[PDB]
Design a protein around this ligand. Sequence first.
Ligand SMILES: *[C@@H]1O[C@H](CO)[C@@H](O)[C@H](O)[C@H]1NC(C)=O
Ligand SMILES: *[C@@H]1O[C@H](CO)[C@@H](O)[C@H](O)[C@H]1NC(C)=O
Lengths: 96, 291, 145, 58, 58, 49, 71, 48, 49, 49
Amino acid sequence: FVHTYLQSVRKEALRVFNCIDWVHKLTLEITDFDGSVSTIDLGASSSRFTNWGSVSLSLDAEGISGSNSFSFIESPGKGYAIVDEPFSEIPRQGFL
Amino acid sequence: PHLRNRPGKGHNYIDGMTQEDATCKPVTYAGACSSFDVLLEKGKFPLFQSYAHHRTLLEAVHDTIIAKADPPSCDLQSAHGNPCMKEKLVMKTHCPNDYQSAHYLNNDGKMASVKCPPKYELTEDCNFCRQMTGASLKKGSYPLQDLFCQSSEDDGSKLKTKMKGVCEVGVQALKKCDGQLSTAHEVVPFAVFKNSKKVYLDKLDLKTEENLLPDSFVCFEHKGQYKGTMDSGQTKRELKSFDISQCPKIGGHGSKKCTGDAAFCSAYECTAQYANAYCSHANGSGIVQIQ
Amino acid sequence: SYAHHRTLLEAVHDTIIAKADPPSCDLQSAHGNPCMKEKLVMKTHCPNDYQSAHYLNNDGKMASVKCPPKYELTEDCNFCRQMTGASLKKGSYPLQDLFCQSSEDDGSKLKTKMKGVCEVGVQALKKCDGQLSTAHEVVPFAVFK
Amino acid sequence: SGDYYWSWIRQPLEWIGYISYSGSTYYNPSLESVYYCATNYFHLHDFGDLYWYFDLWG
Amino acid sequence: SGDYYWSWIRQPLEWIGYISYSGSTYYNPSLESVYYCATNYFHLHDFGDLYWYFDLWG
Amino acid sequence: GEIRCNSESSVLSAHESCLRAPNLISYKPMIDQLECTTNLIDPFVVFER
Amino acid sequence: ALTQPTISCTGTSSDIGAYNFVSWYQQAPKLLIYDVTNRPSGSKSGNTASLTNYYCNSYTSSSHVVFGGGT
Amino acid sequence: GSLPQTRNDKTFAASKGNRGVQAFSKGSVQADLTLMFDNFEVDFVGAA
Amino acid sequence: VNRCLSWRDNETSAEFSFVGESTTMRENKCFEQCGGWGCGCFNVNPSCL
Amino acid sequence: VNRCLSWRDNETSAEFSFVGESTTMRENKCFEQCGGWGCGCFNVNPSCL
Ligand SMILES: *[C@@H]1O[C@H](CO)[C@@H](O)[C@H](O)[C@H]1NC(C)=O
Ligand SMILES: *[C@@H]1O[C@H](CO)[C@@H](O)[C@H](O)[C@H]1NC(C)=O
């Protein structure tokens, strides 16, 4: 009789995800009246409730830029990376 | 019934209603206290039941954490023509039957209670006193609000209620408004800080951090236990409360041999001889901080 | 599972396992002595009406805890409590789950080798400073000649 | 009629108890289980039932 | 008060039994079912209940 | 119409009967304080466009 | 009960210290001073009332009536 | 496969503040942002 | 931990009982965090948010 | 409101009970309206038609 259990070797983990689509995203610096301490970020057809009302962005050209078939890895506090395999929701032996 | 090992003194009684000192002076596993057992009923007082190892309002009052208001409890028998029942009438409560008193935390951050005349009981809304012939009133007071208290030194003199779109909450007049006024009854969370008044909040973002202070340990003893208090033959297996002030601190002096779990042994000095009491670490205790 | 191997008491009576110094220091006469040290680091569970309980101490011998007369060991086997009109059992509760046997293989060079352990039970494996995760765990153990 | 509290006092004073207009009875804690009867009959207060302001002694 | 063991001895010594401060009774195995009563009253040990150090004989 | 309702009152009161897509809310459980935020198409902007 | 020997009626925090309902009787005794000062002269300070056979009674936190020892 | 990698002319890379990834691709957009209720005025600015 | 990952989005925690019954659109999540004296808890198993 | 949106078309309201049982083709609807003193009702939750 054999009882086997897995244990983690390194005290770190990696997060694997995929990008279904890419979205245009504009960063604005709001040089307000008597003071320019205001920086905002917003996407297509979206509004942000800043001071003195709100600021909206149309960006009517293209709200998307297609999709992809790779996978992305994130190591928290260390950065990101790209792996050239399709993102599979079912585990497979010999893969990521 | 580990929840009946109260932190601090555990004095769950109110001034004047001192006819239940057998079981409401320090609350132990044995007796039954009317002003405490209501908190442990299933489905009622869920916020305290989550933070079950923190002090109640009466416990905080008896530890001088929370002060007592001016006219601490203006009796309806002698002061029913005085502007007393003002903060109570803006709350929507629900008292059970056979209760002659009920305590709450008033606007100033102190404890005030409503006491019916003798032989009367508070109605279902705790607003009126009614008399029933041949009824046995409970000896305690019903806790009106769902709250838990603790000991803090953080100052809050600059803390004030900041609610958006609210002209007036409870008895506090936030601002002056004219026109439409949607008036309703709502469940508002609130907090009380040192040197401040009641502070109503739009959101409740609170976190707890653990420590090794004496209030975070539950120390008990057995009844009939050899070489301990109440060392006599028993007909039932029951526990007894123990005071952690006797167990020596690590690298220190004490009066009783004391053993416990990992946290206690890390904090206090666990004995190598026969122990007098067992000191476990509190289920959920700690220090709670509100955002 | 190993039901046809000797118990701790059987191994003691066959001279396989020795008896510790103070074989069982009675709590009636030696409650102020540093006896209950290896027992206090174990998490046990005794039934009721038991006046004694035996275990295999660190040195590889058999020790036991005996309550004063008419007292019984509590549910954690750490204290003695007295019940009026209770009939105590005449034996001692085996604290540990173990089986013994007769062996001639030498083990004088055998020692505990646990990775990432500063201290297990009553044995101080090494000296460590900093964070120390302290817990109760089920550790298998063996005793050799 | 008039919301009175009929109380009993004794001198071997010491308050024994009162019976109210509503039939509610309140007793001294020691005696829970010359004799006079005095009640607040003239100095009535509109804000409270100050029944210990004894006058009109029996 | 003082955690004493009141024991009975007889001489036709021979220990009969003791009754403890806690009410626990221990008897001689043979007699389980002149008379003196001596208890350890002065030479108390903090580490154990050495009740057979008999003094203050009855 | 990622979040859609059946009446103006349901929209103005955020009633639970309104339907919405899976995973609209973005959670940032960083150790100091949580950040609950989401990016939603403003229907008024599209209406004015 | 209250402690009695200007006659001074000294009590605990429950009576006099909390409530201002203390009255005096002269002995079928006759009531002289009610509500500390009102007369159909007395005063209060801390837990002790003063009046310038005289008995003092007061109202306790337990809704009871406590009579003085008497002078 | 650290991020600064180019695949079929896409050149994915870390976004500023390391909060995600980007995608550098040939293209352009038309942006017409709108202000609303813009009111930010004080009195001390009356001086020249 | 078993309750921590298997938290249903439509089930409310006991801490937020002052919300009680509400008709607003709402969801509930549970996130594991660090466990240890540096995190703030004596236990080393992961805490919950 | 829960009864208001979930109104079955074949279920008759209690107000129109003088109709009672009829063999004519018929349907029943419920519409939310304003709620507030300007609308005509002290409550601010939406009324029903
Ligand atoms: C909604 O919650 C109830 C009670 O909490 C539960 O019985 C029901 O299964 C839940 N609905 C789901 C999980 O779809
Ligand atoms: C018609 O009405 C009856 C009673 O009102 C109901 O039981 C039945 O389900 C309805 N038919 C539907 C909803 O198709």
